[PDB]
Design a protein around this motif. Structure first.
Motif, short mmCIF file in Angstrom:
data_model
loop_
_atom_site.label_atom_id
_atom_site.label_comp_id
_atom_site.label_asym_id
_atom_site.label_seq_id
_atom_site.Cartn_x
_atom_site.Cartn_y
_atom_site.Cartn_z
N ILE A 1 0.82 -1.20 0.00
CA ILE A 1 0.00 0.00 0.00
C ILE A 1 0.86 1.26 0.00
CG2 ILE A 1 -1.97 -1.08 1.13
CD1 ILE A 1 -0.27 1.15 3.41
N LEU A 2 0.26 2.38 -0.39
CA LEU A 2 0.98 3.65 -0.43
C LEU A 2 0.12 4.77 0.15
CD1 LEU A 2 3.15 4.44 -3.58
CD2 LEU A 2 3.70 4.56 -1.15
N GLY A 3 0.78 5.79 0.69
CA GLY A 3 0.07 6.92 1.27
C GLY A 3 0.05 6.87 2.79
N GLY A 4 -0.96 7.50 3.38
CA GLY A 4 -1.07 7.52 4.83
C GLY A 4 -1.21 8.92 5.38
N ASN B 1 3.22 11.17 2.56
CA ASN B 1 2.99 12.23 1.58
C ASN B 1 2.01 11.76 0.50
OD1 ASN B 1 5.91 13.85 2.25
ND2 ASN B 1 4.22 15.04 1.37
N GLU B 2 2.03 10.46 0.22
CA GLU B 2 1.15 9.89 -0.79
C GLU B 2 -0.31 9.90 -0.32
OE1 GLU B 2 4.29 7.79 -1.12
OE2 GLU B 2 4.62 8.84 -3.02
N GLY B 3 -0.49 10.00 1.00
CA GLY B 3 -1.83 10.02 1.55
C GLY B 3 -2.54 11.33 1.31
N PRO B 4 -3.61 11.59 2.08
CA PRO B 4 -4.08 10.66 3.11
C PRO B 4 -4.69 9.39 2.52
CG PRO B 4 -5.63 12.46 2.87
CD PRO B 4 -4.44 12.80 2.01
N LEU B 5 -5.01 9.45 1.23
CA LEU B 5 -5.60 8.31 0.54
C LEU B 5 -4.61 7.15 0.44
CD1 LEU B 5 -8.46 8.96 -0.18
CD2 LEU B 5 -7.00 10.98 -0.36
N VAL B 6 -5.13 5.93 0.41
CA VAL B 6 -4.28 4.74 0.31
C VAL B 6 -4.43 4.07 -1.05
CG1 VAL B 6 -3.75 2.48 1.28
CG2 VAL B 6 -4.46 4.35 2.79
N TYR B 7 -3.30 3.75 -1.67
CA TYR B 7 -3.31 3.10 -2.97
C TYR B 7 -2.38 1.89 -2.99
CZ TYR B 7 -3.18 8.20 -2.84
OH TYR B 7 -3.28 9.52 -2.45
N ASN C 1 -10.27 -7.23 3.93
CA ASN C 1 -10.72 -8.22 4.92
C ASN C 1 -11.98 -7.74 5.63
OD1 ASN C 1 -9.42 -10.30 7.49
ND2 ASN C 1 -9.50 -10.81 5.30
N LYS C 2 -11.85 -6.68 6.41
CA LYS C 2 -12.98 -6.13 7.15
C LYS C 2 -12.55 -4.90 7.95
CE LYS C 2 -11.25 -9.52 10.09
NZ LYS C 2 -12.18 -10.33 10.93
N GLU C 3 -11.56 -4.18 7.44
CA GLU C 3 -11.06 -2.98 8.11
C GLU C 3 -11.26 -1.75 7.23
OE1 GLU C 3 -8.27 -1.94 10.82
OE2 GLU C 3 -9.93 -2.88 11.91
N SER C 4 -10.74 -0.61 7.69
CA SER C 4 -10.86 0.64 6.95
C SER C 4 -9.50 1.12 6.47
CB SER C 4 -11.52 1.71 7.82
OG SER C 4 -12.57 2.36 7.13
N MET C 5 -9.42 1.49 5.20
CA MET C 5 -8.17 1.98 4.62
C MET C 5 -8.26 3.47 4.31
SD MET C 5 -6.02 -0.49 4.57
CE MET C 5 -5.33 -1.95 3.81
N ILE C 6 -9.48 4.00 4.30
CA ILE C 6 -9.69 5.41 4.02
C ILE C 6 -9.30 6.27 5.22
CG2 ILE C 6 -11.34 7.16 3.30
CD1 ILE C 6 -11.01 5.22 1.16
N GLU D 1 1.02 2.79 8.42
CA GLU D 1 1.40 1.57 9.13
C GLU D 1 0.17 0.71 9.42
OE1 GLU D 1 4.90 1.28 11.29
OE2 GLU D 1 4.81 3.34 12.04
N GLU D 2 -0.94 1.36 9.76
CA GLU D 2 -2.18 0.66 10.06
C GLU D 2 -2.62 -0.20 8.87
OE1 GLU D 2 -3.33 3.11 13.03
OE2 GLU D 2 -3.00 1.08 13.81
N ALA D 3 -2.97 0.46 7.77
CA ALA D 3 -3.40 -0.23 6.57
C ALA D 3 -2.53 -1.45 6.29
CB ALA D 3 -3.39 0.71 5.38
N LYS D 4 -1.22 -1.26 6.39
CA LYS D 4 -0.27 -2.34 6.15
C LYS D 4 -0.32 -3.37 7.27
CE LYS D 4 3.67 -1.37 3.16
NZ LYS D 4 4.87 -2.05 3.72
N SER D 5 -0.60 -2.91 8.48
CA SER D 5 -0.68 -3.79 9.64
C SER D 5 -1.91 -4.69 9.56
CB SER D 5 -0.72 -2.97 10.93
OG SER D 5 -0.38 -3.77 12.06
N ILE D 6 -2.91 -4.24 8.81
CA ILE D 6 -4.14 -5.00 8.65
C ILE D 6 -3.93 -6.21 7.74
CG2 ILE D 6 -6.45 -5.00 7.64
CD1 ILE D 6 -6.10 -1.76 8.46
#
Length: 109
Positions: free
Chosen positions: A31-34, A38-44, A70-75, A80-85
């Motif tokens: 994933i990218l962003g966060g 700097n790529e965020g806040p959106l995740v790609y 799976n069942k989490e939020s990426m928006i 680190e979170e998105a990737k941690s999911i």
């Protein structure tokens, strides 16, 4: 009535598409962003690692804006979170991979 417009942190997209990737070994997606990155806040999709579940699917690609895995939020989440999911996802289970993102592009004409 309804209030908002102008700007909002969360708001489902019109071209929001949801698919499923046959789960065998694991997600194996980047994933990218966060909100902090700097790529965020959106995740790609940073890059489709060769040898993953989605990799075979193809439906997804590097650059696409994710929404939830799976069942989490990426928006509007932490890089680190998105990737941690992903690594935190069920994994080695029976159910497939729940991929949610936005699909929309120029086709024909």
């Amino acid at each position: 009535g309804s209030s908002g417009s102008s700007g909002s942190p969360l708001d489902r997209d019109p071209a929001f598409r949801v698919i499923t990737v046959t789960k065998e070994t694991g997600l194996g997606l980047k994933i990218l962003g966060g909100i902090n990155r700097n790529e965020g806040p959106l995740v790609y999709i940073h890059e489709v690692i060769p040898g993953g579940d989605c990799y075979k699917d193809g439906r997804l690609k590097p650059g696409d804006q994710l929404v939830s895995i799976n069942k989490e939020s990426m928006i509007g989440v932490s890089f680190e979170e998105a990737k941690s999911i992903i690594t935190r996802a069920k994994l080695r289970s029976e159910s497939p991979w729940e991929i949610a993102f936005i699909r929309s592009g120029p086709s024909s004409g």
